[PDB]
Structures are given as C-alpha cells and as structure tokens.
C-alpha cells in the first residue's frame, strides 16, 4: 500500500532508476509495474507471483 497504491505482487530490486520526482511506474496497459520505497529510496518491481 505504498502511499495509497493498494495491490498484490512480488517485490524485487531492479536497475530501473526513476527520476528524483517520480514515485511509481506503469506499463502500456496502465498497470503498476514498479514503485519506490518511501523509507529508503529504492526502485522495486511489482510482478504477479504465479
């Protein structure tokens, strides 16, 4: 529930470093693909488990 982004998925580190003002990312299907950790700024991908 990062800053109100409710969902379910597996979090994993990635090299997709966002911009300093950007918070989360989306794909061509308007689905959230990655989000940053508001405690320690790191990009974590959001993918369905199985």
């Amino acid at each position: 529930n990062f800053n109100g982004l409710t969902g379910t998925g597996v979090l994993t580190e990635s090299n997709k470093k966002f911009l300093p003002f950007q918070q989360f990312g989306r794909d061509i299907a308007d689905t959230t693909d990655a989000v940053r950790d508001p405690q320690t700024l790191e990009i974590l991908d959001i993918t369905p488990c199985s």
Binding site: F21, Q22, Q23, F24, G25, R26
Partner: peptide, 26 residues
Amino acid sequence: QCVNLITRTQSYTNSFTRGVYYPDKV
C-alpha cells in the same frame, strides 16, 4: 515609492513548441 510602471504588448512575439511538463509522477 510606488509610481513607476512600464510595459509593452504586441499580442504575439513568438510561437513555438514549449511549455510541456510532466503531468504526473508516473
């Protein structure tokens, strides 16, 4: 002292593709 004010207008000086900002933090 507040008595001075100068300005000029022409309704156009340039017209290019600028002023595009990030609409969201996505």
